[PDB]
Amino acid sequence: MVLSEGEWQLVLHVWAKVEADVAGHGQDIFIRLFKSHPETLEKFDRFKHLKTEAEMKASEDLKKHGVTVLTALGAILKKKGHHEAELKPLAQSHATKHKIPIKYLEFISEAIIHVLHSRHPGNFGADAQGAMNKALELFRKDIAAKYKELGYQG
Numbered sequence: 001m002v003l004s005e006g007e008w009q010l011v012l013h014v015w016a017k018v019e020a021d022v023a024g025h026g027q028d029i030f031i032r033l034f035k036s037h038p039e040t041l042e043k044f045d046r047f048k049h050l051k052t053e054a055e056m057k058a059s060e061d062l063k064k065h066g067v068t069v070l071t072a073l074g075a076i077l078k079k080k081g082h083h084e085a086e087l088k089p090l091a092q093s094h095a096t097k098h099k100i101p102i103k104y105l106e107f108i109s110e111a112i113i114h115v116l117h118s119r120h121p122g123n124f125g126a127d128a129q130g131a132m133n134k135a136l137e138l139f140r141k142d143i144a145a146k147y148k149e150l151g152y153q154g
């Protein structure tokens with residue numbers, strides 16, 4: 001799949017808002033993920049003891065993790081589809097060290113979309129949401145392809 005320039009512009013316009021508070025958006029997204037799909041929490045040795053939303057909000061390590069994750073994702077989005085080199089180390093650690101199934105990348109995609117919809121309604125109407133969905137689908141398809149090359153394709 002291929003996004004048009006106009007679709008990329010919608011994606012990077014709302015992402016520019018996210019980047020005004022990377023740490024805050026990172027927290028909301030991981031809390032949404034962990035609350036909606038608790039099984040995902042089990043993949044994180046560092047966080048799986050966290051029992052409540054309050055504990056998650058107070059965790060300094062989870063906040064730092066969320067910043068690392070959104071920073072990596074933002075670098076990929078700003079490539080506008082030319083992201084082969086960025087995806088390679090990411091695919092390798094998630095396939096063979098962390099062991100993250102493609103299904104869980106769909107779950108975090110839904111969490112990102114929910115949080116942008118809640119925080120940026122004026123910059124995230126239906127066309128912008130359609131464009132971000134397409135960007136994230138592109139990301140997932142290209143990581144699934146690398147997963148297969150690396151021997152996991154989980």
Ligand code: HEM
Nearest residue numbers: 040043044045046068069072073090093098100104105108
């Ligand atoms: C937008 C999707 C994602 C991005 C951009 C992303 C990015 C990252 C980055 C950059 C790191 C640190 C370096 C590394 O180990 O490669 C990381 C670590 C990790 N990722 Fe993700 N990731 C994503 C989705 C997920 C999902 C959905 C899960 C699990 C449900 C996951 C589980 C992990 C784990 C277990 C670590 C190690 C954390 C630690 O103990 O320090 N990732 N991820």
